[PDB]
Scaffold this active site. Structure first.
Site, mmCIF file in Angstrom:
data_model
loop_
_atom_site.group_PDB
_atom_site.id
_atom_site.type_symbol
_atom_site.label_atom_id
_atom_site.label_comp_id
_atom_site.label_asym_id
_atom_site.label_seq_id
_atom_site.Cartn_x
_atom_site.Cartn_y
_atom_site.Cartn_z
ATOM 1 N N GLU A 145 0.821 -1.222 0.000
ATOM 2 C CA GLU A 145 0.000 0.000 0.000
ATOM 3 C C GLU A 145 0.851 1.266 0.000
ATOM 4 O OE1 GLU A 145 -3.260 -0.133 2.788
ATOM 5 O OE2 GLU A 145 -3.985 -2.061 1.986
ATOM 6 N N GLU B 222 -5.515 -8.208 -1.216
ATOM 7 C CA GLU B 222 -5.885 -8.029 0.191
ATOM 8 C C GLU B 222 -7.324 -7.547 0.260
ATOM 9 O OE1 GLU B 222 -3.041 -6.146 3.280
ATOM 10 O OE2 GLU B 222 -5.033 -5.621 4.032
HETATM 11 O O1 LIG Z 1 -7.915 -2.655 7.054
HETATM 12 C C1 LIG Z 1 -6.574 -2.449 7.422
HETATM 13 C C2 LIG Z 1 -5.696 -3.274 6.562
HETATM 14 C C3 LIG Z 1 -4.439 -3.846 7.456
HETATM 15 O O2 LIG Z 1 -4.009 -2.954 8.280
HETATM 16 C C4 LIG Z 1 -3.225 -4.272 6.459
HETATM 17 O O3 LIG Z 1 -2.041 -4.269 7.190
HETATM 18 C C5 LIG Z 1 -3.184 -3.347 5.262
HETATM 19 O O4 LIG Z 1 -2.162 -3.762 4.348
HETATM 20 C C6 LIG Z 1 -2.904 -1.831 5.737
HETATM 21 C C7 LIG Z 1 -4.383 -1.251 5.810
HETATM 22 C C8 LIG Z 1 -5.213 -2.528 5.376
HETATM 23 N N1 LIG Z 1 -4.325 -3.263 4.645
#
Ligand SMILES: OC[C@@H]1[C@H](O)[C@H](O)[C@]2(O)CC[C@H]1N2
Ligand SMILES: *[C@@H]1O[C@H](CO)[C@@H](O[C@@H]2O[C@H](CO)[C@@H](O)[C@H](O)[C@H]2NC(C)=O)[C@H](O)[C@H]1NC(C)=O
Ligand SMILES: *[C@@H]1O[C@H](CO)[C@@H](O[C@@H]2O[C@H](CO)[C@@H](O)[C@H](O)[C@H]2NC(C)=O)[C@H](O)[C@H]1NC(C)=O
Ligand SMILES: *[C@@H]1O[C@H](CO)[C@@H](O[C@@H]2O[C@H](CO)[C@@H](O)[C@H](O)[C@H]2NC(C)=O)[C@H](O)[C@H]1NC(C)=O
Ligand SMILES: *[C@@H]1O[C@H](CO)[C@@H](O)[C@H](O)[C@H]1NC(C)=O
Ligand SMILES: [Ca+2]
Ligand code: NI
Length: 641
Positions: free
Chosen positions: A158, A234
């Site tokens: 991200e 993800e």
């Molecule tokens: O919903 C939170 C998720 C989690 O924290 C993961 O680490 C991430 O890669 C970073 C934000 C999202 N995806």
């Protein structure tokens, strides 16, 4: 009305598997000290074929010593010239997964990076070869030390990609004989990676999979044009109540139907992190009580099974998938060997909300669905039926076989809201069952750890959840009284994913604790400027660790002490002088009851009846003033909830 399922005009895209994420960050932290058999049972529910979630893909964080949502994860290279392939728990987890499923697919992805990679900047693209070297050494170590083949390597979770980095990463992998490792990019949004691939043939050659996060079931035109495999690399991240199971159910089907995504990977694998950390209980199941052995096989496990037990990577989606007339969707797949799997979902809007994105209302109502098998599916006189009703509820029940022996290759069923049907020629399905595990119990109200373990199974003592910095078992052979301690090992700020605190900190215990006494031996390694603390009522952690308030008892190597209301140290409760220097052991006691706190240095009161905020509650904690070496020994806590 009638929905035709057929393959005579060819197949859809190849299916790449369903998986989950361990990491981003420390989501598996509390799994490692489950006693047997419960720890093995949890892992069976996750990875054993034809049993539970039966996952096809395991993706793990490549720890970089920074905070990455619910804690930090240790790197394989804390410092320049440091190499260690036995820290943390992702090695252990990947091997346990492979033991259960030799064909599981392995992915690694960095969130943070050790600070020394940035050469004075919080940026991993300063020296492209160096960062690639670091990442590739993780893959080589996976093979050399644990016999793990990493199938996919990502870029930077991200966070921006660098096209030259991706190319150097490909060049470096090939140089190390890792041609078989594939690259997924960029684990963020569909753009700018998708258009970059159409404009840069060389980038296109080296990127194998476009992995996007939380796409809300849709992709974009540039990604379709690329010809690359498209994955929700993800998704999920929703509390694993029936609502999260409904979210998982809907997007598993509709990520392919609406966005051509042939893999979806849930964050996270299992909720083994304190629930009051960010995004608590957002794993496929819950295992957040190693002290009690209590875990919970949540609804998402059986929602997973409706797909994973009846598909494998390498199967193909049919062209004939879609939405139902009155709400819901259906996908169908074959293996080219005469098997067929049909997965039907009718998740309602009120009962399938994911946290990201929020869908506007859509209607779902009772309907009759008729399916007709054409093409090669024309035979198939029988199909097995597995059924789930969410919300109460009944999970992954096997129903009577349906028979297509009337020659029409056709059947129908009465669907209502919030259901899943799997109809399959496959006969291997099973709702795995172990006996119930122990009842839930709070964190022990008296708890101690002297850290006296000569060959630990894991690099950190149990239940300590690092939220900035990295704490590890430490052996000091030049000492007899503190031969086995817990040490904070970061000496500089990582290349951070989160807003890591300026002080290191590890929390432990019961977040509901309000009255507590915390005691610990501490040792400051840095002369003049060094400092450490013990704390209680620590109310926030993880991504929000900078925000943590509580009661913090600091001592410094210049002969001073501070009592603050916040980890940042902006709000003073008390302060003064103390007979404290570096490189010698002191025993700190902090007592907090109601409105008042006291502190002892070596069993003698240093300050008492100091007014603190109340009501207040939170974990116990240890830590250091900056990213600096320090040691801790003989940790003790007694608390009331
Ligand atoms: O919903 C939170 C998720 C989690 O924290 C993961 O680490 C991430 O890669 C970073 C934000 C999202 N995806
Ligand atoms: C990606 O999936 C979409 C559907 O989600 C495919 O799109 C068109 O979809 C409509 C109905 O949704 C069909 O009537 C069209 O026939 C589809 N287009 C084509 C060319 O067949 C789209 O084809 C998929 N893209 C791929 C597989 O590259
Ligand atoms: C359905 O799937 C099973 C498993 O993939 C198929 O059975 C296997 O068939 C291969 C050859 O096609 C054999 O080498 C394996 O030993 C078989 N394994 C099992 C567990 O049976 C089966 O052929 C497929 N088709 C149908 C109609 O069942
Ligand atoms: C934590 O300590 C506070 C302070 O002693 C407790 O509050 C007191 O509880 C007694 C008996 O329950 C009352 O008579 C007092 O009036 C309370 N005082 C205040 C300021 O609240 C509190 O109940 C303790 N909590 C736990 C869980 O042990
Ligand atoms: C959903 O559809 C049914 C059938 O058309 C209708 O009776 C019902 O009022 C609809 N509900 C909403 C909220 O649109
Ligand atoms: Ca010790
Ligand atoms: Ni709280």
């Amino acid at each position: 009305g009638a929905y035709v399922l057929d393959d005579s005009d060819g197949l859809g895209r190849e299916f790449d598997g369903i998986g989950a994420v361990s990491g981003g960050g420390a989501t598996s932290r509390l799994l490692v000290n489950y006693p047997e058999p419960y720890r093995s049972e949890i892992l069976d529910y996750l990875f054993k074929p034809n049993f539970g979630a039966s996952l096809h893909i395991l993706k793990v964080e490549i720890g970089g010593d920074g905070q990455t949502t619910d804690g930090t994860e240790p790197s394989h290279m804390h410092y320049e010239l440091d190499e260690n392939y036995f820290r943390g728990y992702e090695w252990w987890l990947m091997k346990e997964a492979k033991k259960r499923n030799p064909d599981i697919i392995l992915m690694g992805l960095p969130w943070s990076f050790p600070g020394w990679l940035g050469k004075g900047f919080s940026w991993p693209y300063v020296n492209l070869q160096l960062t690639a070297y670091y990442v590739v050494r993780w893959i080589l170590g996976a093979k050399h030390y644990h016999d793990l083949d990493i199938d996919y390597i990502g870029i930077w979770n991200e966070r921006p990609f660098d096209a030259n980095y991706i190319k150097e990463l490909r060049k470096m992998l090939d140089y190390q004989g890792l041609q078989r490792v594939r690259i997924i990019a960029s684990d963020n949004l569909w753009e700018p990676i998708s258009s970059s691939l159409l404009l840069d043939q060389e980038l296109w050659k080296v990127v194998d999979v476009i992995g996007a996060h939380y796409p809300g079931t849709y992709t974009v035109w540039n990604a379709k044009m690329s010809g690359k495999k498209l994955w929700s690399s993800e998704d999920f991240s929703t509390i694993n109540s029936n609502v999260g199971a409904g979210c998982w159910s809907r997007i598993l089907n509709q990520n392919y139907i609406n966005g051509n995504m042939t893999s979806t990977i849930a964050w996270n694998l299992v909720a083994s992190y304190y629930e009051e950390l960010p995004y608590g209980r957002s794993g496929l199941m819950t295992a957040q009580e190693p002290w009690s052995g209590h875990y919970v096989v949540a609804s998402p496990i059986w929602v997973s099974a409706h797909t994973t037990q009846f598909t494998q990577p390498g199967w193909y989606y049919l062209k004939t998938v879609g939405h139902l007339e009155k709400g819901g969707s259906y996908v169908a797949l074959t293996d080219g060997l005469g098997n067929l799997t049909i997965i039907i979902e009718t998740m309602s809007h009120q009962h399938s909300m994911c946290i990201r994105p929020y869908l506007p209302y859509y209607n779902v109502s009772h309907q009759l669905a008729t399916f007709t098998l054409k093409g090669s599916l024309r035979e198939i006189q029988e199909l097995q039926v597995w059924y789930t009703k969410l919300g109460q509820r009944l999970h992954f029940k096997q129903l009577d076989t349906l028979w297509l022996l009337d020659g029409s290759g056709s059947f129908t069923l009465e669907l209502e809201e919030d259901e899943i049907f799997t109809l399959t020629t496959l006969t291997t399905g099973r709702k795995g069952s172990y006996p119930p595990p122990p009842s839930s119990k709070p964190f022990p109200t008296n708890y101690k750890d002297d850290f006296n373990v000569e060959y630990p199974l894991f690099s950190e003592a149990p239940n300590f959840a690092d939220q900035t910095g990295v704490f590890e078992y430490y052996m000091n052979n030049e000492d007899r009284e503190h031969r086995f301690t817990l040490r904070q090992v970061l000496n500089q700020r990582p290349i951070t994913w989160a807003a890591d605190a300026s002080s290191t900190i590890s929390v432990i215990g019961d977040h509901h604790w309000t009255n507590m006494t915390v005691q610990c031996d501490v040792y400051i390694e840095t002369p003049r400027s060094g400092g450490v603390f013990i704390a209680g009522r620590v109310n926030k952690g993880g991504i929000l660790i900078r925000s943590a308030t509580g009661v913090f008892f600091w001592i410094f190597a210049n002969g001073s002490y501070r009592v603050t209301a916040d980890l940042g140290g902006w709000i003073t409760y008390a302060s003064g002088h103390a007979d404290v220097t570096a490189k010698r052991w002191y025993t700190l006691t902090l007592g907090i009851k109601g409105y008042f706190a006291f502190g002892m240095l070596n069993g003698t009161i240093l300050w008492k009846n100091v007014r603190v905020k109340y009501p207040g509650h939170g974990w116990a904690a240890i830590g250091t003033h900056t990213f600096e070496f320090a040691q801790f020994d003989n940790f003790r806590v007694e608390a009331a909830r």
